[PDB]
Amino acid sequence: LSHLPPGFLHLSKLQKLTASKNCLEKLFEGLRKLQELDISDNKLTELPALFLHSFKSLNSLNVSRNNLKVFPDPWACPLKCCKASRNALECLPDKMAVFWKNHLKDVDFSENALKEVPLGLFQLDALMFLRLQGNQLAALPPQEKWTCRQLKTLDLSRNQLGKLEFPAFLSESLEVLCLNDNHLDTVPPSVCLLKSLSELYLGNNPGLRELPPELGQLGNLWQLDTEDLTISNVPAAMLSYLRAQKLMKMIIVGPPRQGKSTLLEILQTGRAPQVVHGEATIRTTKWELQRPAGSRAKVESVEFNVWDIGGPASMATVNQCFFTDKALYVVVWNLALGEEAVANLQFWLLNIEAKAPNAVVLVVGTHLDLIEAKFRVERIATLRAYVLALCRSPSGSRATGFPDITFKHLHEISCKSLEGQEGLRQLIFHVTCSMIPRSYLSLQEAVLAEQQRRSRDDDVQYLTDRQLEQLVEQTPDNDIKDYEDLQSAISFLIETGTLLHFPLYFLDPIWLSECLQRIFNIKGSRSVAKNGVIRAEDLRMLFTQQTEEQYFQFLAKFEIALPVANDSYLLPHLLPSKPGLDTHGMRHPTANTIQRVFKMSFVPVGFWQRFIARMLISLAEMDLQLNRCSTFRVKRNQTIYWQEGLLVTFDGGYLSVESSDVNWKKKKSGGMKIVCQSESAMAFITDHVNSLIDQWFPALTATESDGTPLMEQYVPCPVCETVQYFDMEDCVLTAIERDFISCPRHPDLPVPLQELVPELFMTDFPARLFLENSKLEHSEDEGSVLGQGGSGTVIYRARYQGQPVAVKRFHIKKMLRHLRATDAMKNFSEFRQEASMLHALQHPCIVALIGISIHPLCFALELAPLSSLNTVLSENASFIPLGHMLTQKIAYQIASGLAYLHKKNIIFCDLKSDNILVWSLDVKEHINIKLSDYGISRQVYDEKVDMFSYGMVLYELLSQLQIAKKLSKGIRPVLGQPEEVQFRRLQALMMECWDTKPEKRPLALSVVSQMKDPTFATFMYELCCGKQTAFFSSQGQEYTVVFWDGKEESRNYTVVNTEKGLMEVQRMCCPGMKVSCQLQVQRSLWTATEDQKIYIYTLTPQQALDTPAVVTCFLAVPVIKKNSYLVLAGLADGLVAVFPVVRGTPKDSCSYLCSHTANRSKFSIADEDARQNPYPVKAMEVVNSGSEVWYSNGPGLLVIDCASLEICRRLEPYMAPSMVTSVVCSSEGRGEEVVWCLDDKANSLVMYHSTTYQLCARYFCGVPSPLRDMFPVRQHLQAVKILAVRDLIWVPRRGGDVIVIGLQRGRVIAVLKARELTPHGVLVDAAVVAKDTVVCTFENENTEWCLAVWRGWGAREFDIFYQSYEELGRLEACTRK
């Protein structure tokens, strides 16, 4: 097309017009409602102003890719976006801020030919985006006259700028700055202010040679463009040097004997030692070290926070806590104690590496003066070789899990003779090599002053996070703004020896170490009532001041003051010695008796104390209940224990963890004696925690350098006992694929693995499940894989006697056999843990197990045939893709599953729509979706973390670093207004659970209990239509369409449609005096004012016909005669008039019927009767398929027929002087019209059979609690007006609630009260707008009408909704199995 036809101009109702990809040389050769229009990629050369001025309500403009020369002047319109890129426009108007200042958002003008821009162009406060690429802008307007505070992306690439200042309020708004292909040579200082800027582009600038250091003050910047840049300050992650625009922690350790303190003053000063150290758990000074001879390329002065964690053979396994990364560990050992000192030193070397990796470690030999000089050179060479033999493998490589120690790492001190003192000083300085601070050093004096202030007063010398950040901020020159900088401020402060993180912060270890010493010295006491239990109030006098909440918190992290029930505390260091009571006597019935033995190489001193105490607290947790451990739920009895081993009797099962000598090929060392016989659940909590205590206390997994991982697990052969020990390294590996093994001494007799190691087969579980491989068929292909869950846990598609299931097999295929041995062991250690927690779940909406297999090791879950929730929502992604009814069912099932597992002390993690499995989308069926729990917790996961993700998973239901980072501070995603979603009540849960306040969010049972109220899903939204006069509706689909307001020329009608919730007409002028009644059918409107006249419109009255009185209501009836919808209606005087309905008729034949005259003669009712008072006629109805009609007459109900047009019956269901309000005919169940009626003052209700004309029932509507009440059938409580919703019958009240009742016995089934609407006013008029929705108008004292809309649920919807709620509750509570 070369031009748009002129006829499009006259289309004033047109809104969208697309004419792109054409040859429109001229746009033309009214339209005030146009919103979207594109004329881009055309041959347009100039835009006439007359054509564009007609768009008074335009929203989008597109004149890009055109040959335009002069831009048209702006006009009055709420334009939102304009595009004029790739044009030849050499000028722009300077009036866009007159009308588009608060409306225009997006401006595209790239690839244009402006040498300058107007100043007013930057005055748009509502600007969203701006592009100016490929422009000749050699100058810019001044920054002080710019008000564009909402701009987010600024584009200035391919410009002549700089051949330059911008305002600072774009710092928190702008994110992308484009300055590529420019002639800029120096960076203006204003660039260093944009905090929220994310991407920087300043490439293709030959004039760039240096970058100001202040550019690094922006933390959101991540992208730096250095392409085609002749930069110099950039070294050959780029913000590291821009962002940053001597103190080391050294630890000396060793055996409790030897000096370990004489080395200090030998390094501190010269000469022989002259100070007696005595005994001290720790001492700390800031030792100085200068440059020795030969030093080069190093700092002149380096300050060491010297440090000696010594102990009197005690304080082991706790002094390890004083180990930090990036430290200089130097162990001190005696050269005169022979090779056995090196074997002792094995513990320290492995402990240091396993706790503080990537930290340099040195070895030094003191007290060597006893070594004679004749063989001295030979002696260290032999002694150093063994020390190197530990760190270096026999092949020459570094031993696994050992510090990096080379040949040039061993030296000598000779404290008394002073020889070699200078040797250490040069190397310690030398080894320091091969390794923001201005503010971090500024924090140093604060914490050191914090140490000094608490030193005089002996205050508790530990700083919690609350007292830290205030201390950080209060310091002078406090520039700590970045959150990661504050964390790095503490992280760096650990390595200067001033703070200890303890993953609560501890500053001075001297107070910390001494405080633990006093607790370690309670052996001399009142015998603590034996068996190591101390009362809480009995420990107060044993440095503390009312800080027991936190002072006794880190004592639990030290495994020394674990809490116990009945308000008691335990001390591992003071366990009972050996209460015998004939232990191991007749504790061996030899019935499914399993025994397991460990080696652990060398037994430490802090092992038994930290182990037995750890057993008791975990053991006492199981019976107190009446991924974390979820096994061994058996009963606890007599709980006898001592300093080494315990003995607990569960189900008559002697679980003994006693300790005794163990004899492998090396017939030495101590080990475990784990036995667990019962009748046959074989559960090992001992092995699980014992394999976990090594994480808190490493250095027991000693590889011994030369391929000897002497952390061994052994079991005795029951046949051989009738002793050889069966290794774990081959037992478990033979337990992963086969059931029978070959005993070395009994090759022909295969011992059953179910007896030699029952736990690895988890015979604990009941025999019911026991999935077999014979019947099941499955495949290992990728096509059957349903994803992964981390650490193996592969899923496949399997058939279980014909029922498809999703097996979860643990496929993990990562000396090397020990590596596989510990890899296979952790699988069963976690396979049982997840199986125990899943098998315990029997909730209907939780995926339950169907079986467990060992050969192959796997177990099958329940597979949803209809994929995941994310998958099904993909194709359907208007609003509410799942469905109005399906949404509530699904939103309750998730809550129900959340309610059960939160009750079961199980906490989800990453509640994602992918994790949701959907079974059936059918509404009639009961259960649709179910969960799959990942992980538990003990009574980032913080219980209510799922509720924060509950909104996110349900956010997409209504519809990764920087991908999900705004949730930290709290930013709500894009959600529509409640007025259009039509499901407002649940959108309260979107405002809910979406705030940083965790305790504000409700509990899972509270959300489930909220599903009980049927108001939750029936409610659509709340709408306000301003100040109106009366509520009117109309028949059909058009909904309520009038909402009159005003008087005479101010008489206006506000059209409010319910389906969308918008106002297509808002107070449009229309002549006419005050109106009382209206009706709309087909295309005919019958609007009647209170001037006793009727006006009609073909939607300025078409014609006017007078009436004897003021009419009250209209209702057309289907007489099925000449397709006439006879519009007979009653007036205030009580008479009724019948009018023709064809527009091609005069419409003047009133044919009025005298209601009083008919009653006088036909029914012999005297004028003196109260029923003869001229009551206004309230409402009609249609009955007998329109063949007969009733209408209101005070207390009676006169009946009128379409055939004879005469009253045939007189019926009185009320007593004088009552007036009836409204009357409705449903006839939905089966024939048998069930017409109803109400009252103005008696608030009653009637039950009438049309054929019988009998008062079947009289239900009273005045009951304040109509929740599931009943009635027999043959100020805020008054009923307002009746209306039929499909089959059910609603009785809205003046209090705002609607009383829906069911049809024989009549039962009221719900009370859809809306307690969130009381302030909005009082309900006056309510009516049905469509067969699926009902509206009610809340009118307040201020004459303002508020629209409340409820879903039109019939008998079917409520019955299936009510049964769905109760059945799932039945399906869980009634399941006692």
Ligand SMILES: Nc1nc2c(ncn2[C@@H]2O[C@H](COP(=O)(O)OP(=O)(O)O)[C@@H](O)[C@H]2O)c(=O)[nH]1
């Ligand atoms: N004669 C001599 N004694 C030494 C040497 N090195 C250490 N010592 C002794 O070690 C003792 C100090 O040990 P101590 O500090 O109590 O050990 P710690 O508790 O582990 O720190 C001093 O009494 C010294 O006599 C040495 O080279 N020569």
